[PDB]
Design an enzyme around this catalytic site. Structure first.
Site, mmCIF file in Angstrom:
data_model
loop_
_atom_site.group_PDB
_atom_site.id
_atom_site.type_symbol
_atom_site.label_atom_id
_atom_site.label_comp_id
_atom_site.label_asym_id
_atom_site.label_seq_id
_atom_site.Cartn_x
_atom_site.Cartn_y
_atom_site.Cartn_z
ATOM 1 N N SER A 189 0.813 -1.232 0.000
ATOM 2 C CA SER A 189 0.000 0.000 0.000
ATOM 3 C C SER A 189 0.841 1.274 0.000
ATOM 4 O O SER A 189 0.471 2.249 0.658
ATOM 5 C CB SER A 189 -1.030 -0.001 1.127
ATOM 6 O OG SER A 189 -1.826 -1.172 1.088
ATOM 7 N N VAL A 230 -13.131 -2.219 0.785
ATOM 8 C CA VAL A 230 -14.307 -3.107 0.819
ATOM 9 C C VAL A 230 -14.676 -3.559 2.235
ATOM 10 O O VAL A 230 -15.853 -3.476 2.600
ATOM 11 C CB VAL A 230 -14.180 -4.297 -0.172
ATOM 12 C CG1 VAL A 230 -15.150 -5.429 0.150
ATOM 13 C CG2 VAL A 230 -14.377 -3.829 -1.603
ATOM 14 N N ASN A 241 3.153 13.767 2.235
ATOM 15 C CA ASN A 241 2.096 14.672 2.695
ATOM 16 C C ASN A 241 1.677 14.395 4.154
ATOM 17 O O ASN A 241 0.960 15.208 4.734
ATOM 18 C CB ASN A 241 0.878 14.580 1.765
ATOM 19 C CG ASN A 241 0.394 13.174 1.446
ATOM 20 O OD1 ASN A 241 1.137 12.330 0.951
ATOM 21 N ND2 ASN A 241 -0.887 12.924 1.649
HETATM 22 N N1 LIG Z 1 0.440 10.172 -1.144
HETATM 23 C C1 LIG Z 1 -0.807 9.742 -0.943
HETATM 24 N N2 LIG Z 1 -1.574 10.385 -0.034
HETATM 25 C C2 LIG Z 1 -2.802 9.920 0.226
HETATM 26 N N3 LIG Z 1 -3.425 8.863 -0.304
HETATM 27 C C3 LIG Z 1 -2.644 8.247 -1.206
HETATM 28 C C4 LIG Z 1 -1.358 8.614 -1.591
HETATM 29 N N4 LIG Z 1 -0.846 7.720 -2.513
HETATM 30 C C5 LIG Z 1 -1.799 6.838 -2.646
HETATM 31 N N5 LIG Z 1 -2.927 7.080 -1.890
HETATM 32 C C6 LIG Z 1 -4.115 6.278 -1.752
HETATM 33 O O1 LIG Z 1 -3.858 5.294 -0.761
HETATM 34 C C7 LIG Z 1 -4.004 3.984 -1.340
HETATM 35 C C8 LIG Z 1 -2.645 3.531 -1.820
HETATM 36 O O2 LIG Z 1 -2.804 2.250 -2.432
HETATM 37 P P1 LIG Z 1 -2.623 1.779 -3.958
HETATM 38 O O3 LIG Z 1 -3.824 0.951 -4.163
HETATM 39 O O4 LIG Z 1 -2.144 2.758 -4.991
HETATM 40 O O5 LIG Z 1 -1.331 1.017 -3.442
HETATM 41 P P2 LIG Z 1 -0.660 -0.234 -3.956
HETATM 42 O O6 LIG Z 1 -0.740 -0.177 -5.471
HETATM 43 O O7 LIG Z 1 0.827 -0.125 -3.527
HETATM 44 C C9 LIG Z 1 -1.505 -1.524 -3.041
HETATM 45 P P3 LIG Z 1 -0.785 -3.173 -3.000
HETATM 46 O O8 LIG Z 1 -0.072 -3.282 -1.635
HETATM 47 O O9 LIG Z 1 -2.049 -4.056 -2.950
HETATM 48 O O10 LIG Z 1 0.169 -3.537 -4.094
HETATM 49 C C10 LIG Z 1 -5.050 4.205 -2.427
HETATM 50 O O11 LIG Z 1 -6.362 4.320 -1.871
HETATM 51 C C11 LIG Z 1 -4.591 5.536 -3.021
HETATM 52 O O12 LIG Z 1 -5.656 6.221 -3.672
HETATM 53 N N1 LIG Z 2 -1.160 -3.793 1.671
HETATM 54 C C1 LIG Z 2 -1.299 -5.024 1.177
HETATM 55 N N2 LIG Z 2 -1.269 -6.071 2.000
HETATM 56 C C2 LIG Z 2 -1.280 -7.255 1.339
HETATM 57 C C3 LIG Z 2 -1.334 -7.469 -0.031
HETATM 58 N N3 LIG Z 2 -1.205 -8.816 -0.322
HETATM 59 C C4 LIG Z 2 -1.073 -9.386 0.847
HETATM 60 N N4 LIG Z 2 -1.098 -8.497 1.897
HETATM 61 C C5 LIG Z 2 -0.857 -8.795 3.315
HETATM 62 C C6 LIG Z 2 -2.127 -8.853 4.148
HETATM 63 C C7 LIG Z 2 -1.775 -9.881 5.214
HETATM 64 O O1 LIG Z 2 -1.060 -9.272 6.293
HETATM 65 C C8 LIG Z 2 -0.854 -10.845 4.465
HETATM 66 C C9 LIG Z 2 -1.504 -12.091 3.919
HETATM 67 O O2 LIG Z 2 -2.544 -11.744 2.978
HETATM 68 P P1 LIG Z 2 -2.977 -12.650 1.733
HETATM 69 O O3 LIG Z 2 -1.879 -12.589 0.726
HETATM 70 O O4 LIG Z 2 -4.299 -12.098 1.241
HETATM 71 O O5 LIG Z 2 -3.165 -14.046 2.316
HETATM 72 O O6 LIG Z 2 -0.254 -10.082 3.394
HETATM 73 C C10 LIG Z 2 -1.391 -6.341 -0.884
HETATM 74 O O7 LIG Z 2 -1.351 -6.367 -2.111
HETATM 75 N N5 LIG Z 2 -1.382 -5.142 -0.188
HETATM 76 N N1 LIG Z 3 -7.518 -3.240 0.123
HETATM 77 C C1 LIG Z 3 -7.556 -2.677 -1.207
HETATM 78 C C2 LIG Z 3 -8.577 -3.442 -2.079
HETATM 79 C C3 LIG Z 3 -10.041 -3.364 -1.648
HETATM 80 O O1 LIG Z 3 -10.305 -3.278 -0.418
HETATM 81 O O2 LIG Z 3 -10.928 -3.414 -2.540
HETATM 82 C C4 LIG Z 3 -7.862 -1.188 -1.145
HETATM 83 O O3 LIG Z 3 -7.815 -0.619 -0.037
HETATM 84 O O4 LIG Z 3 -8.132 -0.581 -2.204
#
Ligand SMILES: Nc1ncnc2c1ncn2[C@@H]1O[C@H](COP(=O)(O)OP(=O)(O)CP(=O)(O)O)[C@@H](O)[C@H]1O
Ligand SMILES: Nc1nc2c(ncn2[C@H]2C[C@H](O)[C@@H](COP(=O)(O)O)O2)c(=O)[nH]1
Ligand SMILES: N[C@@H](CC(=O)O)C(=O)O
Length: 345
Positions: A16, A266, A299
């Protein structure tokens, strides 16, 4: 004959970090013709462009916003919901026009929403798993039962017409990579979430490293041009008993950061938030070896705080033989909020 043309986005913390943002940002700036990922339903990626258009993708790369989009590729390591894929395609049908080829690797896993999520209900509380069916789907694929025609995209294409046009062959996959001019490979999850990082069993079902993401996308190693590592000023974990942290970091609160509690959209589970870990950065830098770094959620800190984290990241990189340069800084969730480091410090 030139092969180094893959820019791979990899998370350097527990996920994230805003990989969805840097993917869409880089796609728009660099105009890759091929965008590729190997996502699982645990990962949702958000991109917001300069006009405020938002893409929350669980299947499709965020890089489909590339002005020179020619190929969209869903890796063999992908675990996807066909329903979700259909909605994502429909949502961006203006971008996924007639001259855009969507290629689903024949061995990409089809998520059986009911059965796979049900199998993850226990780990959803025990390890704070997203319980999205990611591993359950992956395990079903690993069973390699010849009587099971419902798990890989190749077999599902024979009875579910929705993906039949997208499902390619392994040769088509290799040729699409060969024919690509510039590739954006989108990594998911997080370095410290890697199955073989130290927090086992409080981890994901695979390694979240460049070597594993390239493997899961079927990208030959010489194709790798650069790794773009992503990091947050305050790393997060999902809510619940989601695992430990590094010895140089402490679990903080959203109230302590003066920020609106972040939650998985979700389920609305509030994300655990931590102080920045230099140990984590060293560990991430060692394995991930990024060439460039995107430092997001700047930020959340004062200029002094995030400027300090930039220097920390760069020294943690140098200490692990990595020449990583924090090139990009995130000050919000949109394209307008991605700043070149050299412009703000
Ligand atoms: N600098 C920032 N300040 C505030 N919100 C931000 C931000 N950068 C991203 N976000 C928001 O916070 C979340 C960041 O998650 P995003 O879904 O882009 O991350 P990711 O692609 O690394 C998730 P994953 O761990 O599943 O790979 C999203 O809801 C995005 O809109
Ligand atoms: N932020 C974030 N956490 C994840 C993601 N995939 C897995 N995790 C984290 C959540 C749990 O702490 C652990 C196991 O989750 P899972 O892969 O859904 O079984 O890894 C992802 O894409 N984003
Ligand atoms: N956890 C991810 C996916 C999801 O909840 O739909 C998000 O915060 O966007």
């Amino acid at each position: 004959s030139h092969m180094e043309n893959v820019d791979l986005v990899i998370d350097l913390q527990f996920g994230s970090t805003g990989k969805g943002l840097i993917a869409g940002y880089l796609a728009e700036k660099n105009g890759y013709d091929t965008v590729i990922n190997a996502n699982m339903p645990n990962a949702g990626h958000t991109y917001i462009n300069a006009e405020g258009r938002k893409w929350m993708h669980k299947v499709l790369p965020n890089g489909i916003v590339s002005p020179n989009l020619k190929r969209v590729m869903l890796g063999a390591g992908s675990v996807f919901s066909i329903n979700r894929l259909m909605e994502e395609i429909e949502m961006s049908k203006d971008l996924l026009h007639d001259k855009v080829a969507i290629l689903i690797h024949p061995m990409a896993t089809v998520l059986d929403e009911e059965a796979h999520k049900k199998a993850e209900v226990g780990i959803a509380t025990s390890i704070g798993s997203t319980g999205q069916g990611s591993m359950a789907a992956m395990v079903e694929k690993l069973q390699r039962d010849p009587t099971n025609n419902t798990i890989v995209a190749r077999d599902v294409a024979q009875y579910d017409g929705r993906i039949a046009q997208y499902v390619c062959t392994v040769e088509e996959w290799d040729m699409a990579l060969m024919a690509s001019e510039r590739i954006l490979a989108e990594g998911a999850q997080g370095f410290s979430l890697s199955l073989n990082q130290e927090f086992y069993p409080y981890c994901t079902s695979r390694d979240c490293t460049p070597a594993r993401f390239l493997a899961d996308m079927g990208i030959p190693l010489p194709m790798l041009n650069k790794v773009i590592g992503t990091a947050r000023c305050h790393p997060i974990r999902v809510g619940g008993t989601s695992g430990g942290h590094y010895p140089d970091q402490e679990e903080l609160t959203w109230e302590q950061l003066g920020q609106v509690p972040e939650l998985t959209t979700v389920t609305k589970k509030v994300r655990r938030v931590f102080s920045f870990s230099f140990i984590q950065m060293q560990k991430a830098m060692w394995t991930c070896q990024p060439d460039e770094v995107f430092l997001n959620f700047c930020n959340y800190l004062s200029p002094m705080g995030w400027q300090d984290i930039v220097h920390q990241i760069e020294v943690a990189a140098q200490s692990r033989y990595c020449d990583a340069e924090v090139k990009y800084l995130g000050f919000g969730p949109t394209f307008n909020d991605v700043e070149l480091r050299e412009d703000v410090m």
